[PDB]
Structures are given as structure tokens and as C-alpha cells.
Design a binder for this molecule. Structure first.
Ligand SMILES: Cc1cc2nc3c(=O)[nH]c(=O)nc-3n(C[C@H](O)[C@H](O)[C@H](O)COP(=O)(O)O)c2cc1C
Ligand SMILES: Cc1cc2nc3c(=O)[nH]c(=O)nc-3n(C[C@H](O)[C@H](O)[C@H](O)COP(=O)(O)O)c2cc1C
Lengths: 122, 122
């Protein structure tokens, strides 16, 4: 379901945000557009170095939200666009989703988000 | 309390993410690094065109989280850095906080974030 414009965003660098639900309120962490790996079957993989509070949150509520964008891709009414992605998350420490990001030697795990919806919000 | 490195990030374009607490989970919306105005008092001002769900969430729980960064500013271990900002939010529709973003013709309000902590997370 990810549209072509999402793939054009990923050709450009930028800050990705990942929100999870904590018992206390939301939590928000980041990665880089250039670190995301998209796999077949609507999966986006993030290399995990820290994300310890995020991991604790996902263990109790697997729903996540993610945003990303780029001023270098056109939106509906001028330069710049981005996406709100909703999905479910899991952490993996082995298997092909882990091997997709194992080139980052600092990664202790892979955060795998299975996308359920993608909205271009600009 | 906002440090010099944060102002260096703001000289570069990027996607800002703002998380609020909803009824049924977090919500996450964006702005651009180039749209933020910073006022005396640890106050960050965001021009509001939509953010209707965000505004409903803030009316119930004023706490927000914000992230932003840039690959063009050095972090602690290599190129690229960014920040986790925690603060409290209010929407303003008159006064100096609104005037700071009034040049945006589509703005309906100013989202004013009063910063309580700022962490450089890379
Ligand atoms: C621009 C940016 C990119 C980041 N990329 C990563 C990343 O790819 N993986 C990672 O684990 N943390 C990354 N971080 C740090 C995370 O945002 C987070 O601060 C850290 O993993 C701790 O997560 P936690 O608060 O869930 O314990 C990045 C931070 C910034 C500002
Ligand atoms: C990169 C980017 C920049 C955006 N900047 C703004 C902005 O400055 N102000 C705004 O109202 N919405 C902006 N949006 C749209 C918001 O993220 C959000 O989708 C919209 O305001 C609706 O908010 P709500 O879901 O809280 O109702 C931006 C979207 C993207 C992808």
C-alpha cells in the first residue's frame, strides 16, 4: 500500500519520528530516512541501537505512529511533503528482518513496523 | 535552557514531529524546521493551519513531545544530531505569540510550546 511518493521521500535524507504509547503519556524517538529498509509485505525495518523505553512500550502496546518527509519532493500544493504511517511493531534480534539491517554494527535489534495505513499529509 | 546546538539545527531544513496524547493513543503531526520561531522564555512557536485533532488533545493534556534534527550539524559521535524537547502547549489566536507567525496566510493559530527540557539525543 505504500505509494510511489513515499519512496521518493526516502531518496532524500531526513529525520523520522516514531511514537509509542507509554503508561505515562507518549514517547517519541527518531531514525534517519536513509536508515529505513522497506521489505516486501508492507514492512519497514529500523536499526535499533538504543530504543530501550520504546521497546518496553511496544511490549505492552504494539501500535506505533511514524512520520517522515522531505522538502525536496513536491506535495499537493507546493514543494515539500511527508507521511503519517500507522502500523504495528515488533523487535527482532535474528532472522531475515534483523539481517536486513545487520550492516549497522551498533544495532542490537531490528524494529519491524508492519504498515496498516499511509497518509500523505501535505 | 535551549542550547546553541539547537539553534544550529534550526538553520537547516527538516521535518519536526510533535506528539500529543489522544483518547485512543498518541497522535503525531509535523511542521518544518524553517517554520519554527523561538521567543525569549524557552518558547517555541509553530504556525497552525490544521492540527484540529492535536488541539483537541492539548485541551485535555497540555504535555507535548517534539523532535527535530539535521544531518548537517555534528553530533557526539559523527555527523548528524537532533533533540527531544518536552514542554507544555497552548494555542493562541491573538497577541505577540500569534503575531510571530502571522506572515503565514493560512495560519489559524500559533501553537506555543514552553520548553521544560531539551536533550540532544545523538
Ligand atoms: C536524528 C536521529 C536519528 C536517530 N537514529 C537512531 C537509530 O537509527 N536508532 C536508535 O536506536 N536510535 C536513534 N536515535 C536515538 C533515538 O531517537 C533514541 O533517543 C534512543 O534510541 C533512545 O531510545 P529510548 O528513549 O526509547 O530508550 C536517533 C536520534 C536522532 C536525533
Ligand atoms: C513535513 C510536514 C510539514 C507540515 N507542517 C505543518 C504546519 O506547519 N502546520 C500545520 O498545521 N500542519 C502542518 N502539516 C500537517 C500536519 O502534520 C497535520 O497532518 C495537520 O495539521 C492535521 O493535524 P491533526 O491531525 O492534528 O488534525 C505538515 C505536514 C508535513 C508532512
Amino acid at each position: 500500500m505504500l505509494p510511489g511518493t513515499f519512496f521518493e521521500v526516502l531518496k532524500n535524507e531526513g529525520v523520522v519520528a516514531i511514537a509509542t504509547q507509554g503508561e505515562d503519556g507518549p514517547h517519541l524517538v527518531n531514525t534517519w530516512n536513509s536508515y529505513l529498509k522497506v521489505l516486501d509485505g508492507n514492512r519497514i525495518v529500523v536499526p535499533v541501537g538504543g530504543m530501550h523505553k520504546t521497546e518496553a512500550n511496544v511490549a505492552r502496546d504494539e501500535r506505533v505512529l511514524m512520520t517522515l518527509g522531505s522538502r525536496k519532493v513536491a506535495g499537493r500544493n507546493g514543494p515539500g511533503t511527508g507521511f503519517l504511517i500507522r502500523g504495528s511493531a515488533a523487535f527482532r534480534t535474528d532472522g531475515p528482518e534483523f539481517e536486513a539491517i545487520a550492516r549497522f554494527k551498533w544495532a542490537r535489534a531490528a524494529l519491524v513496523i508492519t504498515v496498516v495505513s499511509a497518509e500523505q499529509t501535505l
